[PDB]
Every structure is written in structure tokens, then in C-alpha cells.
Amino acid sequence: EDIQSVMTEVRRSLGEIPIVESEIKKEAGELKPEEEITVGPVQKLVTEMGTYATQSALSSSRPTKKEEDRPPLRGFLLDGDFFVAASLATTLTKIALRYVALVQEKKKQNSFVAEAMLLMATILHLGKS
Amino acid sequence: HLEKSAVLQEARVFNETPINPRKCAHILTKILYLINQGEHLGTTEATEAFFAMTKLFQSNDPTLRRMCYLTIKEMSCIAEDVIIVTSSLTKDMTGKEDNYRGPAVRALCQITDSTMLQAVERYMKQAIVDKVPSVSSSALVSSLHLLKCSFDVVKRWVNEAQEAASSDNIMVQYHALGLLYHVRKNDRLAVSKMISKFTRHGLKSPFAYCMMIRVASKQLEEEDGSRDSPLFDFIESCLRNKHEMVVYEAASAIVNLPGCSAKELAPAVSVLQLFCSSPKAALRYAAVRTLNKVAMKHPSAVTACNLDLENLVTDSNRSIATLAITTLLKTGSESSIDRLMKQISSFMSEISDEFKVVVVQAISALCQKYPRKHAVLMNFLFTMLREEGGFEYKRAIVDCIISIIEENSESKETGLSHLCEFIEDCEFTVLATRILHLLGQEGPKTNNPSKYIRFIYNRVVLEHEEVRAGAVSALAKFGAQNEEMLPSILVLLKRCVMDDDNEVRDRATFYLNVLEQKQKALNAGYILNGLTVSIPGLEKALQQYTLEPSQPEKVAATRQEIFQEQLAAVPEFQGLGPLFKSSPEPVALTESETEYVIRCTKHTFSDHLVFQFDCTNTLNDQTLENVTVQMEPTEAYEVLSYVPARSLPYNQPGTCYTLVALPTEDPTAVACTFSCVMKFTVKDCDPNTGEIDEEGYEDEYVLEDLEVTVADHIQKVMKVNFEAAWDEVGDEFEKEETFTLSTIKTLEEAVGNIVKFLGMHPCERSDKVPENKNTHTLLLAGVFRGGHDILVRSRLLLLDTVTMQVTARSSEELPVDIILASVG
Amino acid sequence: LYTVKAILILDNDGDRLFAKYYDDTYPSVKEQKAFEKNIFNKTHRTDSEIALLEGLTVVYKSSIDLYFYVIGSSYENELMLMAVLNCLFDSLSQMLRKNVEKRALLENMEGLFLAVDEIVDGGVILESDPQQVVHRVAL
């Protein structure tokens, strides 16, 4: 229920923010429509989530940036989205609490295939005939 | 070399009894060394060292005095109770010898603040007049610093400053004129007097010329009262002294903004002045140039060309070569671009590293800036992509793509596709992002998307997160825009690459789920072409220029509407007649940035006139409140109401209005004069923009009269056939009067006078009348306030003067009477 | 009133043997040294009276182990700047009683500090006469 407070120090703080936009855009509202509150409930978050994506709104003392990451991504998909305000239904929450395609094993589907240092050596091995 | 702590500390002995000029001077040298070598003083020890040194001023030795001046300025800000040192500096300053004189004024004045300003003045006046450059110049620079603390003390010095100005000694003059311009300024005109006095003179001071050129560069024709020319007889427009910098500065301003026009011994419109200096050594750099020039940089460009072009090609020296590119760039233009582009192509061969990136950017950048076609720009942008392959960047993907979608897009994607064949993962995140973004957005039917997809698919595996995330989202948009595409999206997204990495996964889970699962109302909506994330300007070209040689919206379109908007906010004006029109001849009552700027417009309504007075109090000593512009009509008009300007502070516009009712039976015109006086309450102000005193006095400022013309009442129109309209409006309000226009000897002028005055456009283009014809019929039409047409017929007889019988008809008695009266 | 941006006399690395800043743009050591390294890298190992760095004409000369700098505006030329740079070289030489090298400068750090302040004063060219500077300063 913390979220206005945590997000807001960062939202008005600086660092590097390109890719931040993309990830916050699909993300901020999600899960249960009104289950938070510190001085901004889940709805303030959807407001915020939309501003950060590409809109404008006073919420979390404004977001750091609004202008999205790499050219294709844009705000718009998610802006349309949040049909049911940050709630597990057919919104961001759905997407967030679901995993894109099959995700199992160490076949590299949300995986990385053993221990990262051993893998560098295995990748190196071209196995040229 | 040194330790700041030890030296700052041992300085404290001065504060007690020991003064030892040798030891202390050394310790001081050490302080200057700590700064110079690059160190930062500690504040406690600094503060202590500063109070200690002041004792050392007792002993008058020229080296110790010198140490003391540099050390107190450096330690001044990181020290306390510094005020004690003023006396000691004055004592030193009056002591005769340049070692004390010049260096003290400078140290003293730096520490000196408005309280202390008064003290230094006698000694300052004595030091400024010196033709001994050290004392005078130090005193002149010192005065510049002092303008901050207190302006007024410095201003008194204008006479001593001027006295130095008359020297031809380079320093004394440079400093004197430069400083003066800053000091005496209270208005443009007083500075301008200072400049004209020196202006006629052929100096041997290049610095004075330069500092002055800058003051001069704009046209000044009020120098020492007035004069008939922007004239500068000191090189700015003249070329009395040759010396390549002064010559360059002067020549670029004068050519297309005369400081004076061309003289046989001083070109100043012609391109020449730069060019005669142009073949030279290292010196050439100023000389060879251009900027502006008559009428273009291009006839100019040819002279100089041998110099700029040979150095630029030959020298793979950075220092020469840079001067040569800047010089090429300067002799450049729209025309020059053919030449400029080959040279810039050539240039990278001399210095090729960043300079390589810059030339491939420059050739594109120049093509965008100076048109050799937008296509060619894209083709150059391909060459940039080819050569560097990585010094393109992220800002390039956005700029190339935005620029490209003006024309190039189908080609650009395709080119990009080929370009992508380069290098699988060293090509960078950015190129992959460009082919990806463009292939996504265009949705190639110009080439088969399958090559593009195959190229991008490999790049993603081994390149950064941002592109792999880019690739999934693009694919999704690519799906929504083109149905065909969906099968490729599925093979790509299931892969561990375009989804299921990290960032790439999150975006993908969203983008995928929206395409796969959901309606694609969202997906459809989202693609509007599949455009970039932001549309900036065209960033590259300016960047490139320096780097190489190292919604206004509107409502109104008519005066009546804009005024009508201003009026509409206030109720009374629309409630008491609605606005037919507002004047096509608004008259400014009082001139801009004098005492007041008042512009008044007379607005006509159905039965009323409202006068809007835009009032500015440009009174520096006052701020105004409850300001109104009062009115006395010279005919029968009732003044119903005044609407005040709430406040008019210094330099802030406000509007006040007077509503009056129009007569609707008047036998003489609605062309009428109102005497205007603004009355207001003054509260004292310190000039800034506004600030009011606790109490004040009533004051009035007189204004010019406002004249209302028949033109304000009528809006002009012509008719296809006057005769019908002319009868149709009302021959029942018909009145006829005969006039003689004796000051107008032909019909054409005569028609113009009735048309302007009345505010009626003569029908059928009847302002052009057969020259010197015996009879003519002049057809006038326009609509009068209230919205009723007014037609006027003037049957012109030409003798040697014009006589006319003017018959007017209108839907009212008033327009007829009004026109007839106004004309004569 | 402004011509000279800064004066630097640098060893043959660009490191600060000396710089005195007639701009307010370098007061901290880190940045004063960075500037110094920046101007020395462009200008050095190509001696001329011209260099263009940072959009400003930089006029420079060299000695055995130093490069001597005036940085000034580029609306001017080398020659105006050069007159300051010639004063700078000359005045230090006559003052120190030995030509400008790292050794002369270090030998008399005081003569060097004082002499440069007379040449430039807050970016205005205070003095440009080598002889005048030297008499004006006391070792």
C-alpha cells in the first residue's frame, strides 16, 4: 500500500531514464483496483502509469520522463489498456501475471542455461568441423 | 609542489608582532602557488591568514605589495573581516609608481563594495586619466567591477574615462571606450555621443576598434545628437587600418547591414574588404572569410577559394586544417554546396577518426541545409551508415527515420536492409533498431519483408536489450498494420531472443498478449504508421557545423475579431450594441517607451462606439493603479462608462475602455475627435517592472486625441452592380450635396479620398478612372455599423479640379448624413 | 570588455605547471586541468599561431618543454591574441631572467604569477607590452 511514497522519490529523482519508460508503461497500475493508499491509491498509480507511458498528470510528484524507449514501443497500447483499472482481468495485470509463451526448463525460455560463468566458455566453443 | 594547510597556517604569525617582509612575501607566494598548482584552501586557516596579512601592508616593499594584491583577491571570498584591508590599499594606491598604482586599484576595487566605493573615488579619478597604460587600464577595468556594487560612483568617472578615450594608446583607449559604453548608459543616445567623439579618427589601436565594432555593428544614427549616416570612420565600415581580425569583423556586418556604405578607400557593401587581406599566412584565417556579403556569400566565396581549398586538402595538421574547413564553410552557401560537398568528402582523408563521422554527417547535413535534393541527403545518410556503422547513435535512428518519412521511407528501409548485411552485432543496437523500426512501420511491399526479417532476426540474438525489446513491439505493430505479417511474428516471438530474455520478455509479454490474445483494438489503435517515439527537429546539421573544425494558433484574421474578443470579455460593450466592426485605422496616441505607450482603437457597434485604450505606464519612477483614459467628445456622443486598467506598473500593458453611444440622427459626421487624458493614482516604484510604495499621490498624464473616422463605422465591400444596390438600400434616406475637391486635380485621387475616409471600397474597381475624363460615376459600397449597407454615388466632373455631386443612400438617415459631411 | 578567455602555460603533457583563468569558467582544479589537457591536445604537435578549439581561436607557441597559451575569441584572429601570447612569453622571459621552460617558471613561481596578472585582468587585456610588465613586477 506504500506505492505513492516509494515511487514518488524516484519519479522526481534523476539518473538515466530511457528504457525505464517502457517498463513502467506496461507495469505501474496492476493487480486489485483499490488495495493501496499512502497518499495515492492504486488509481493514482494507473494515472501515473499513463503519465509515465506518454501522457501528462500530476501524480507521484510527476514522473521522471514520458517519452518512451526505442522507436517502436510507444505508450499507446497500454494507454488504451487498463480497461478495468489495474485489475486482474484482461489488462496489464493479466500480462504481468502471465508469462509470454512456454517458460520451462533451461531451454532459455525465461531461463539462462546453467551458471553464467560456465556458459561463456560453452558459447565460445564454435565446434567447427 | 606544496601543502595548503601548512602554508595557510604559518601565515598566522603576521597577526601578532612579526611583519618580516621576506618571510611573509614568501608565505604569500606559496598561497598563490597552492592555487596555481591547483589546490583548494581550507576556510578556517584562510580566514586567519587574511586577517594576519593586513598587518603586512604597513611595510611598503614593491614585491611584498604585489604578493599582497594577488593573495587578497584570491583569499577575499574565503576569508572574513576583510574590510580592514581597504585603508591599506588606498595608502598603497596613492603611492606613485606603477607597481603600486595599477595592481592596488584592481585589488582594492575587487574587495570594495558600495559602502567603500566612496573612499576609492579620489584615488580612482587620479588613476583613470593616466596615459601610462597600467594605471589607467587597471583603474578602467576596476570601474567595470564597481558598476555592480554601486553604479552612481562609477558614472561620475565618465569624464576621466572619456579623457583616457582620447589616447591612441591601445590599452588606454580600449579600456576607456569599452568601459564608457557600459558606464554612461542610461539610454542609447548618451553612449552614442561617447562613440561618435572617437568615431572620426583613424586609430592605431586594434583592440579599441574591435570592442567598439561590437557596439557600433548595429545602425546608430543618433551619435552625438544626430547625424545623417550610420557612419563609422573607424574600421567597422572603414578599413583605415588593415589587420585581418578587425577587417573580418567589420566586413561581415557592413556588407548587407551597412554601418556605412562602400567607399573607394573603404569597401562596406562590396565583398572586397575581407578579400584583399585573403592570401596570407596563418593570419589568413580571419581574412579569407565571408559571412553575409553582397548579396550572398557566393561571389565572395570565389576569391578566397584558392586558400581555403588548398589548406583544407593539403594540411593534415589539425590546427591548419580546422581553419581551412571553417573558412570553406564560411565562403559556402546554397550555390557553393556542390563545391562545399566535394571538399568536405575530401577533408576526412586528412583527419579521419571523429572527423570521418563528421564528413559523412556534413555531406548529408549540407544537402539538408542547402538543398541538393532530399533524396541525396538520404543517399549521403546511407554513406554515413556504411562508413561509420556505429557513430550514427540513437538520436540518428530517430532523426533519420523522421526525416525519412518526409519522402524516402520505402527506399530508406530497403537501403537499411542492405546496410544491415554489414556485421551481425558490431553494427550496433542502433542500425538494427533502424531497419527494424522502418521495416515495422512501412511494412515493405517495396521489397519482400522476409530479407529484412531474416537480417534483423540474427542481429537481435547478440545485441543489447533495447533492440530486442524494440523488435517484439515492432513486430506487434507490424502485425496490426498488416495481416500477412502475423506468421513471422509468431516464429520470432516464441524464440528465446525476441521474447524471454529480460526487458525483452516484459515488453513482449505485453505486446504479444495484446496481439495474440486480445482484441487488437489496442494494437490497431497503437499503429498510426508505426512511427518513432518522438519527432524532434533536424539535429545533425548544427552539430556537424561546430564539430568539424575542432503550435502558434490563431482565432482572428481581422482587426474586428481580435478587438471583438478583447471587448467580449467585458459585458457592457456587447450588451450595448454588438460589434459591427472595429477600425481599420487604429491610432497610437502616445509613442512607445517614452512616458506612456497608449494605442487606442475605436470600435463600432450597432449604436455604440467603445474605445479600447491599451495603456502602458513606461514610467520608471511610478507604478499606476486605477488608470482610466478619460474622454471629451467634440460632437453629441454620450459617454456611458469607463472601464479601468486595474494597474499599470512600469513597462506592463493593461487595457482600459470608454464606451460611448453613437448619434443616430446626427447631420454632421461620426468622424469626430475625442480628447483623451489618462488619470491615475501613482504609488512610487523602484524601476524593475513594478513595485508600489505604501502611500502615493494623484497624477495625470496627457494623451493625444483619438479621431474616429467614417472608416471605423463602415466596412468596405464592392458590388457587382452598384445601381441596383444603390437603389435597394434606401432612396428614402437619399440626400445629395455637392463638394469641390480642389486639392485633387483628377478623378483617381478623388475616388481614393472618398473611399479611405468613408471606409467604403469603390465598386467595380472604380478607384481607377479613365485618366482626365470629363464625367465619371463613382460607385461606393460598404456596410455601416448596425449592419446596414451604405452606398454612396459620386458623379464626378473634372475641370482642373474635381467637383462632385455626392448622393448617398443608406437604410438610415445617419450613414447618408455622415458620409456627406465627412467628404465635405 | 573581453578578449582573452584564459592563459595557460603548460608542460608537454597539458598538465598545470600554470594556468590563470581570466574566465570564471574554471576555478576548480579538476576542470582547470581538464581545460589545460584539452587545449594542449589540439594545439600541440602542430605549431602555428592558429588553432580552433572549443569554437574559440587558441593561440599558442612552444618552447623546449612548454606550450604557452592565450585562448580568446574566434571573431578575432591569431594576431590579436598573438600580441598577448608574445607578451606572455616575452615578459616571463625578461622577468624570471631566463627563457620560459618549466625550469624558469618553477625557479621563480612568484615572478610568473605576478607577471601573468599584469598581462590579463579578468579576461580584458590589461597589458601587452613585455617591458612594462617586467618593470611593473618585482621579483
PDB file of N, CA, C and O in Angstrom, chain B residues 436-465:
ATOM      1  N   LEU B 436      14.638  -2.338 -38.240  1.00  0.00           N
ATOM      2  CA  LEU B 436      13.568  -2.910 -37.509  1.00  0.00           C
ATOM      3  C   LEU B 436      12.355  -1.963 -37.416  1.00  0.00           C
ATOM      4  O   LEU B 436      11.219  -2.269 -37.798  1.00  0.00           O
ATOM      5  N   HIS B 437      12.609  -0.780 -37.041  1.00  0.00           N
ATOM      6  CA  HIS B 437      11.632   0.304 -36.847  1.00  0.00           C
ATOM      7  C   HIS B 437      11.010   0.569 -38.227  1.00  0.00           C
ATOM      8  O   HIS B 437       9.780   0.546 -38.265  1.00  0.00           O
ATOM      9  N   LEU B 438      11.814   0.776 -39.279  1.00  0.00           N
ATOM     10  CA  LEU B 438      11.427   1.107 -40.670  1.00  0.00           C
ATOM     11  C   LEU B 438      10.685  -0.034 -41.327  1.00  0.00           C
ATOM     12  O   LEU B 438       9.559   0.172 -41.827  1.00  0.00           O
ATOM     13  N   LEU B 439      11.171  -1.286 -41.213  1.00  0.00           N
ATOM     14  CA  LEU B 439      10.510  -2.494 -41.726  1.00  0.00           C
ATOM     15  C   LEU B 439       9.185  -2.696 -41.010  1.00  0.00           C
ATOM     16  O   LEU B 439       8.170  -2.964 -41.646  1.00  0.00           O
ATOM     17  N   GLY B 440       9.072  -2.387 -39.689  1.00  0.00           N
ATOM     18  CA  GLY B 440       7.889  -2.459 -38.903  1.00  0.00           C
ATOM     19  C   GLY B 440       6.831  -1.503 -39.392  1.00  0.00           C
ATOM     20  O   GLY B 440       5.635  -1.884 -39.519  1.00  0.00           O
ATOM     21  N   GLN B 441       7.220  -0.256 -39.560  1.00  0.00           N
ATOM     22  CA  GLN B 441       6.468   0.930 -39.859  1.00  0.00           C
ATOM     23  C   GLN B 441       5.992   1.055 -41.243  1.00  0.00           C
ATOM     24  O   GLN B 441       4.814   1.254 -41.501  1.00  0.00           O
ATOM     25  N   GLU B 442       6.847   0.770 -42.266  1.00  0.00           N
ATOM     26  CA  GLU B 442       6.467   0.785 -43.705  1.00  0.00           C
ATOM     27  C   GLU B 442       5.663  -0.390 -44.082  1.00  0.00           C
ATOM     28  O   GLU B 442       4.724  -0.353 -44.852  1.00  0.00           O
ATOM     29  N   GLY B 443       6.126  -1.541 -43.639  1.00  0.00           N
ATOM     30  CA  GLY B 443       5.584  -2.898 -43.819  1.00  0.00           C
ATOM     31  C   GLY B 443       5.745  -3.372 -45.215  1.00  0.00           C
ATOM     32  O   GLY B 443       4.749  -3.601 -45.924  1.00  0.00           O
ATOM     33  N   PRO B 444       7.073  -3.317 -45.700  1.00  0.00           N
ATOM     34  CA  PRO B 444       7.516  -3.452 -47.060  1.00  0.00           C
ATOM     35  C   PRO B 444       6.685  -4.204 -48.014  1.00  0.00           C
ATOM     36  O   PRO B 444       6.591  -5.387 -47.811  1.00  0.00           O
ATOM     37  N   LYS B 445       6.287  -3.634 -49.109  1.00  0.00           N
ATOM     38  CA  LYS B 445       5.725  -4.322 -50.169  1.00  0.00           C
ATOM     39  C   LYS B 445       6.627  -3.854 -51.244  1.00  0.00           C
ATOM     40  O   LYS B 445       6.608  -4.328 -52.418  1.00  0.00           O
ATOM     41  N   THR B 446       7.654  -2.954 -50.951  1.00  0.00           N
ATOM     42  CA  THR B 446       8.610  -2.428 -51.948  1.00  0.00           C
ATOM     43  C   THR B 446       9.701  -3.511 -52.208  1.00  0.00           C
ATOM     44  O   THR B 446      10.153  -3.660 -53.331  1.00  0.00           O
ATOM     45  N   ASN B 447      10.030  -4.268 -51.140  1.00  0.00           N
ATOM     46  CA  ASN B 447      10.896  -5.375 -51.242  1.00  0.00           C
ATOM     47  C   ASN B 447      10.193  -6.346 -50.366  1.00  0.00           C
ATOM     48  O   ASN B 447       9.258  -5.991 -49.744  1.00  0.00           O
ATOM     49  N   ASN B 448      10.596  -7.578 -50.292  1.00  0.00           N
ATOM     50  CA  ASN B 448       9.895  -8.657 -49.545  1.00  0.00           C
ATOM     51  C   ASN B 448      10.366  -8.459 -48.108  1.00  0.00           C
ATOM     52  O   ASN B 448      11.558  -8.223 -47.932  1.00  0.00           O
ATOM     53  N   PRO B 449       9.517  -8.470 -47.094  1.00  0.00           N
ATOM     54  CA  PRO B 449       9.937  -8.147 -45.720  1.00  0.00           C
ATOM     55  C   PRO B 449      10.831  -9.281 -45.223  1.00  0.00           C
ATOM     56  O   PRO B 449      11.528  -9.094 -44.223  1.00  0.00           O
ATOM     57  N   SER B 450      10.834 -10.491 -45.910  1.00  0.00           N
ATOM     58  CA  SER B 450      11.473 -11.698 -45.485  1.00  0.00           C
ATOM     59  C   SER B 450      12.993 -11.527 -45.355  1.00  0.00           C
ATOM     60  O   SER B 450      13.518 -11.962 -44.352  1.00  0.00           O
ATOM     61  N   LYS B 451      13.654 -10.752 -46.265  1.00  0.00           N
ATOM     62  CA  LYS B 451      15.060 -10.424 -46.132  1.00  0.00           C
ATOM     63  C   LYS B 451      15.278  -9.613 -44.951  1.00  0.00           C
ATOM     64  O   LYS B 451      16.095  -9.832 -44.106  1.00  0.00           O
ATOM     65  N   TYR B 452      14.428  -8.597 -44.719  1.00  0.00           N
ATOM     66  CA  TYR B 452      14.577  -7.716 -43.601  1.00  0.00           C
ATOM     67  C   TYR B 452      14.495  -8.435 -42.257  1.00  0.00           C
ATOM     68  O   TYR B 452      15.269  -8.227 -41.341  1.00  0.00           O
ATOM     69  N   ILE B 453      13.498  -9.334 -42.193  1.00  0.00           N
ATOM     70  CA  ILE B 453      13.211 -10.119 -41.032  1.00  0.00           C
ATOM     71  C   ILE B 453      14.297 -11.073 -40.697  1.00  0.00           C
ATOM     72  O   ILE B 453      14.808 -11.039 -39.587  1.00  0.00           O
ATOM     73  N   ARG B 454      14.801 -11.762 -41.735  1.00  0.00           N
ATOM     74  CA  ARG B 454      15.939 -12.660 -41.628  1.00  0.00           C
ATOM     75  C   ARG B 454      17.195 -11.866 -41.138  1.00  0.00           C
ATOM     76  O   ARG B 454      17.905 -12.427 -40.327  1.00  0.00           O
ATOM     77  N   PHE B 455      17.428 -10.652 -41.638  1.00  0.00           N
ATOM     78  CA  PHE B 455      18.600  -9.883 -41.264  1.00  0.00           C
ATOM     79  C   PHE B 455      18.483  -9.508 -39.778  1.00  0.00           C
ATOM     80  O   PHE B 455      19.309  -9.770 -38.937  1.00  0.00           O
ATOM     81  N   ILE B 456      17.309  -8.868 -39.382  1.00  0.00           N
ATOM     82  CA  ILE B 456      17.020  -8.428 -38.005  1.00  0.00           C
ATOM     83  C   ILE B 456      17.073  -9.615 -37.052  1.00  0.00           C
ATOM     84  O   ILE B 456      17.417  -9.507 -35.847  1.00  0.00           O
ATOM     85  N   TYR B 457      16.619 -10.779 -37.467  1.00  0.00           N
ATOM     86  CA  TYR B 457      16.486 -11.952 -36.572  1.00  0.00           C
ATOM     87  C   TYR B 457      17.861 -12.387 -35.982  1.00  0.00           C
ATOM     88  O   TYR B 457      18.086 -12.611 -34.805  1.00  0.00           O
ATOM     89  N   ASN B 458      18.885 -12.425 -36.900  1.00  0.00           N
ATOM     90  CA  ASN B 458      20.193 -12.700 -36.468  1.00  0.00           C
ATOM     91  C   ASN B 458      20.745 -11.625 -35.515  1.00  0.00           C
ATOM     92  O   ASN B 458      21.494 -11.966 -34.616  1.00  0.00           O
ATOM     93  N   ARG B 459      20.443 -10.306 -35.782  1.00  0.00           N
ATOM     94  CA  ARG B 459      21.105  -9.195 -35.060  1.00  0.00           C
ATOM     95  C   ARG B 459      20.723  -9.148 -33.578  1.00  0.00           C
ATOM     96  O   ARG B 459      21.581  -8.950 -32.692  1.00  0.00           O
ATOM     97  N   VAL B 460      19.459  -9.495 -33.341  1.00  0.00           N
ATOM     98  CA  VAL B 460      18.837  -9.473 -32.050  1.00  0.00           C
ATOM     99  C   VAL B 460      19.440 -10.357 -31.091  1.00  0.00           C
ATOM    100  O   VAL B 460      19.576  -9.978 -29.942  1.00  0.00           O
ATOM    101  N   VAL B 461      19.939 -11.537 -31.516  1.00  0.00           N
ATOM    102  CA  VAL B 461      20.435 -12.525 -30.633  1.00  0.00           C
ATOM    103  C   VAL B 461      21.604 -12.077 -29.685  1.00  0.00           C
ATOM    104  O   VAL B 461      21.681 -12.406 -28.496  1.00  0.00           O
ATOM    105  N   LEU B 462      22.524 -11.402 -30.360  1.00  0.00           N
ATOM    106  CA  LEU B 462      23.751 -10.956 -29.795  1.00  0.00           C
ATOM    107  C   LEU B 462      23.923  -9.547 -29.512  1.00  0.00           C
ATOM    108  O   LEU B 462      24.974  -9.070 -29.179  1.00  0.00           O
ATOM    109  N   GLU B 463      22.815  -8.761 -29.635  1.00  0.00           N
ATOM    110  CA  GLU B 463      22.807  -7.296 -29.357  1.00  0.00           C
ATOM    111  C   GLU B 463      21.879  -7.042 -28.283  1.00  0.00           C
ATOM    112  O   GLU B 463      21.069  -7.932 -27.933  1.00  0.00           O
ATOM    113  N   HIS B 464      22.117  -5.838 -27.657  1.00  0.00           N
ATOM    114  CA  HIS B 464      21.552  -5.257 -26.427  1.00  0.00           C
ATOM    115  C   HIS B 464      20.041  -5.491 -26.307  1.00  0.00           C
ATOM    116  O   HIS B 464      19.329  -5.745 -27.279  1.00  0.00           O
ATOM    117  N   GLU B 465      19.636  -5.332 -25.033  1.00  0.00           N
ATOM    118  CA  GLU B 465      18.231  -5.487 -24.617  1.00  0.00           C
ATOM    119  C   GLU B 465      17.288  -4.532 -25.395  1.00  0.00           C
ATOM    120  O   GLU B 465      16.237  -5.007 -25.823  1.00  0.00           O
TER     121      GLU B 465
END
